[PDB]
Structures are given as C-alpha cells and as structure tokens.
Amino acid sequence: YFIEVNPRVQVEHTITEMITGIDIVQSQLFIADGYALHDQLVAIPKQEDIHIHGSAIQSRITTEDPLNNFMPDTGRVDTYRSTGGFGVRLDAGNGF
Amino acid sequence: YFIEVNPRVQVEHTITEMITGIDIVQSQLFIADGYALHDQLVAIPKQEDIHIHGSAIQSRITTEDPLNNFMPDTGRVDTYRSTGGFGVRLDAGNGF
Amino acid sequence: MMNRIKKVLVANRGEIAIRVMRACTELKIKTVAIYSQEDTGSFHRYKSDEAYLVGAGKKPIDAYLDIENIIEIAKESGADAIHPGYGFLSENIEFA
C-alpha cells in the first residue's frame, strides 16, 4: 500500500548506491544541469540493465545516549577514530 | 609472458575485492581453516559466476617527498584527516 | 563537463552538505557552503570552496530556513544552482 512520496534525496540513499553502482547525488546534479539519464557521461543504464549487487546496511552514529533515554549528548569530541577496510563506507556529519 | 609468482596477499588485492565482491583476506582464513571455496559460508562463486563489476584504482599515500627525491619524511602527524563518501575505500597503515 | 551549472550553493549543513560538495567537486563544479552562527565551526564549512554566514540573528534552525538570505548569497556568489539537501528547505514550496 502506497503511503508517501519524499521529493528529495534521503539519508539512506547511500545503501542504494552501494548495491546498484549508481552515484545518486551526481545523478541529481547531472539531471538538473539538463542531461538525460543515459547520456554516456551520466552513465545510467536502461532499467533492464540496472541490477542489484550484494546487500548493504546503514547505521547512523549519533550522540543519542541510550543510558539516558536517547537524549543527545553534547560537548567536544576529544577522540574520533573511524574505521576502514573492504566493504565499508563512511559519510561524516559533525563527527570529526 | 609469465614472469613471477608471489605466494602471498598483495598490497593491491584491495582493488580486486572491489570489482569482484570477494573478501580475499577472509577467504584466506577460511581456506586455511580447512574449508572449500564454495562452502556456503565462504561463499566464493563458481568460476563462471565470478564477474567484473565496475573499475577500481589504488593510490598509496606515503611520506615520500617528491620535492626531495621521494625521500620519506619523518615526524609526528599533527593533522590527519582522510575522506569518505560513495565509492571510496581507506586502508590505514601508520597514518592516524 | 557541465552545461549550465558552474557553481552550486549547498543550502544545508552536516553530512548531506558534505556529500553534495563531494559530488560537485567530482564533477568539477565550484561549491558554496552556508553556516548558521551556531555552526561557525561545523566541518562542512571547511569542505567548500566558499562559505558565508546565513540567518544572522535568527534562531539556530530558523537561520537555515532564511530563504531570502539564502537567495541573496546565491546571487552575490554567482551560484547557478542550489542543492537544498534533505530536511530544512528541501521540501518547501516557497523556496523552490
């Protein structure tokens, strides 16, 4: 059952770029400049040629304290060390 | 023309994991434990089902100074800020 | 590489602001960030080629909703286009 349309990018677009290979945010830009999905520069395949590759999960890391009813903590972040390796993606907000 | 066999992982294995989907280092571990490539846990496809997805590039960031004949610089790294976003992978050595 | 869009002003903050900036730089497009007073130190401000204060005097959230100030800055700086991101003004009729 349909419930909603969001006429914008979403937080979770990341996980879609990962399984399809298509840079959604570049696509947005290309589109608005005036191009067409399949123009060789924009490189979006035809619907038939768009496929799922693997599976992806997104976790949003926030200062919501679970030991305090998920109230957002504040302050200076003295240490911030993210992570890496194969199959890992990081999109940083105000965590540096 | 054949020239060499390296009986080990390589620095650039990264770029292969990226276009094939196969975690090479986990595979190594699985193999040595005693499993077989296609055991469902190890999940390596049959040769026919292994494919190329996209293209990947690796650049190795080092303290080799190009303005000084690529002599390795030394010292404390006071600032180190890597990067992120879609299609990006980082495998950290002694850069933190 | 781009037809009409030579410069994009990213009318958001945080993670999505950085994402857009990163997509712009990949396409050789100049980026303009906006920050509220409160966000004078947000790291998305350091990811753009230009940054300008917005909402001077307004409350924290209202400052990123100041349509006319955003248009002033867009115009002042030579921005061909605005990416509204998600949240804030991204779904706002008056702003489009």
**Residue C64, SS3 per DSSP:** helix
Name the helix (H) or strand (E) containing C71.
helix C67-77
Residue type, A41: L
Residue type, B53: H
- Domains present along chain C, CATH in parentheses: 1-96 (3.40.50.20)
Chain centroid, CA B37 distance in Å:
20
Name the helix (H) or strand (E) containing C83.
strand C81-83
DSSP of B43-92, one letter per residue? Answer: -PPPGGG----S--------SEEGGGTTEEP-S--S------STT-----
- Closest Cβ–Cβ partner in A30, A35, A91 for C19: A91
Question: Using the 8-state DSSP alphabet, how is residue C85 labeled?
Answer: -
B8 is catalytic: yes
**Chains in contact with A, counting 3 or more C-beta pairs less than 8 Å apart as contact:** B, C
Stated resolution in angstroms: 2.7
Q: Are strands A71-72 and A64-65 parallel, antiparallel or unpaired?
A: antiparallel
- Chain B from 73 to 92: CB within 8 A of any C CB: 85
Nearest CA among C65, A86, C39 for reference residue B91: A86
Q: Given strand C7-10, what is the order of strands in its sheet?
A: C50-53, C30-35, C7-10, C81-83
SS3 of chain A: the string is CCCCCCCCCCCCHHHHHHHHCCCHHHHHHHHHHCCCCCCCCCCCCCHHHCCCCCCCCCCCCCCEEHHHCCEECCCCCCCCCCCCCCCCCCCCCCCC
Chain centroid, CA C22 distance in Å:
13
Name the helix (H) or strand (E) containing C49.
none
- What is the C-alpha separation between C78 and A94, in angstroms, rounded? 27
Instruction: For C24, name the nearest residue in chain A, comparing CA atoms only.
Output: A26
- What is the C-alpha separation between A35 and B38, in angstroms, rounded? 44
Using the CB atoms, write b or e for A15-41: b if 16+ within 10 Å.
ebbbebbbbbbbbbbbeebebeeeeee
Structure tokens at B39: 């055991």
Question: Do residues C42 and C13 make contact, with C-beta atoms less than 8 angstroms apart?
Answer: yes
What angle is formed at CA C66 by the lines to CA C64 and CA C67, rounded to 5 degrees?
115
Structure tokens at B84: 């992120």
